């Protein structure tokens, strides 16, 4: 499958280091973003602590590493993440933030959508203890013609 | 507004530690004014605003218009910021905003993650990410 390059939005920061990972935890998060296109829940779960959580905010949360892996495995049964572009990354107080676009493709329909997402990651000892992504679900569902909620 | 299960127990996570973060938290406090003319004073001439499920506004005049339009329909009754952080001139806030639709009188606690770009203590960009359909269904108002 061919995926077109994600363009830079108008509001992308004039600060050239805004998209640069400047700490070990930020670097882990950008590596994790790169790994998303693997569509491989077993690969991704290795980034997570045992005590952890994951939530796409328009949907119910998953608590615990097993449940997070199961949620991811379920997601990748239906969707492919074809590309991730992280415009901005920052962090304070043990939380890392990423402003991104993820290209999501619904396997049942063949249709894709570039999702605008702002995500937050909590890390302890270099492991993810929480990951929440904020975006509008209805836009995605309408674009890929697949109800998710 | 309840503390989410995933919210940091360390109160420092929600406290401003930089001048830009302090400004953003002052701005969050000011939102309950529901007053676009007051709020626009926080913005640079070169700026933008977008609730991500809706169209963006570019330039200070357009941002003021969009804010004014918003406050004709909604009141912001409270803003609670659980987490705040920043790097490279961008501030991030994980919050719950309590919004009330004036036409229906119904309220909803919206989970929002927002980003603010600042230059010289003024806002050059503000984007809030959340699910709009949830708000619409809770306050009985077809916003989009
Ligand atoms: O940001 C999320 C939005 C929903 C599908 C996966 C994407 O990465």
CA dist B44 and B36 (Å) reads 14
Residue A67: Cβ-neighbour burial (10 angstroms; 0-12, 13-18, 19+): middle
SS3 A54: strand
CA dist A93 and A122 (Å) reads 9
Residues in chain B: 144
Q: What is the dihedral of CA A52, B132, B10, B22, to 10 degrees?
A: 150
Distances from the Cα of B41 to the Cαs of A13, A35, B125, in angstroms?
21, 42, 13
Query: Residue A142 corresponds to which tokens in the numbers above?
Result: 């309408």
Active-site hit among B10, B20, B61, B97: B97
Nearest CB to B53: which of A26, A94, A139? A139
SS3 A123: strand
> Determined by which method?
X-ray
CA dist B131 and B129 (Å) reads 7
Query: Residue A26 corresponds to which tokens in the numbers above?
Result: 């930020």
Q: How many CB atoms lie within 10 A of CB B7?
A: 17
Query: Residue B124 corresponds to which tokens in the numbers above?
Result: 């050059």
Residue B97's DSSP bridge partners are B79, B110
CA atoms within 13 A on the CB side of A144: 23
Query: Residue A55 corresponds to which tokens in the numbers above?
Result: 């939530």
Query: Could you tell me which residues of chain A have a Cβ less than 8 Å from any Cβ in chain B?
Result: 10-11, 13, 15, 17-18, 20, 22, 26, 53, 55, 57-58, 61, 63, 88-95, 97, 99, 116-120, 122, 130, 132, 134-139
Residue A122's DSSP bridge partners are A95, A130
Parallel/antiparallel/unpaired status of strands A62-63 and B90-101:
unpaired
Closest by CA to A64, choosing from B10, B112, B2, B5, is B5
H/E/C letters for each residue in chain B?
A: CCCCCCCCCCHHHHCCCCHHHHHHHHHHHHHHHCCHHHHHHHECCCCEEEECCCCCEECHHHHHHHHHHHHHHEEEEEEEEEEEEEECCEEEEEEEEEEEECCCCCEEEEEEEEEEEEECCEEEEEEEECCHHHHHHHHCCCCC
Please indicate whether residue B131 is annotated as part of the active site: no
CA dist B24 and B20 (Å) reads 6
Nearest CB to A136: which of B48, B115, B132? B132
Parallel/antiparallel/unpaired status of strands A62-63 and A53-56:
antiparallel
For B41, list phi and psi in degrees, rounded to 5: -65, -20
Query: Residue A109 corresponds to which tokens in the numbers above?
Result: 């329909």
H/E/C letters for each residue in A83-106?
A: EEEEEEEEEECCEEEEEEEEEEEE
CA dist A71 and B23 (Å) reads 38
Q: What is the largest CA-CA distance in chain B?
A: 41
Domains with residue ranges and CATH for chain A: 1-149 (3.10.450.50)
Parallel/antiparallel/unpaired status of strands A53-56 and B57-58:
unpaired
Distance A101 CA to ligand 1 centre (A): 9
The continuous run of DSSP H or E covering A76 comes out as helix A65-78
Q: What is the distance, to the nearest Å, from the Cα of residue A132 to the centroid of all Cα atoms in its chain?
A: 8
Q: Among all chains, which residue has been given the structure tokens 């004709």?
A: B72
């Amino acid at each position: 499958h061919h995926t077109s390059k994600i363009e830079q939005p108008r509001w992308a920061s004039k600060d050239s280091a805004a998209g640069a990972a400047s700490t070990p935890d930020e670097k882990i998060v950008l590596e994790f973003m790169d790994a998303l296109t693997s569509n491989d829940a077993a690969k991704l779960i290795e980034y997570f602590a045992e005590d952890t959580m994951y939530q796409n905010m328009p949907l119910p949360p998953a608590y615990g590493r097993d449940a997070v892996e199961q949620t991811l495995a379920g997601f990748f049964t239906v969707f492919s993440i074809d590309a991730v572009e992280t415009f901005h990354i920052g962090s304070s107080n043990g939380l890392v933030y990423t402003e991104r676009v993820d290209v999501v493709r619904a396997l049942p329909t063949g249709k894709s959508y570039n999702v605008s997402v702002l995500g937050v990651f909590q890390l302890t000892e270099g492991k993810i203890t929480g990951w929440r992504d904020y975006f509008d679900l209805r836009e995605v569902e309408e674009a890929v013609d697949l109800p998710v909620r």
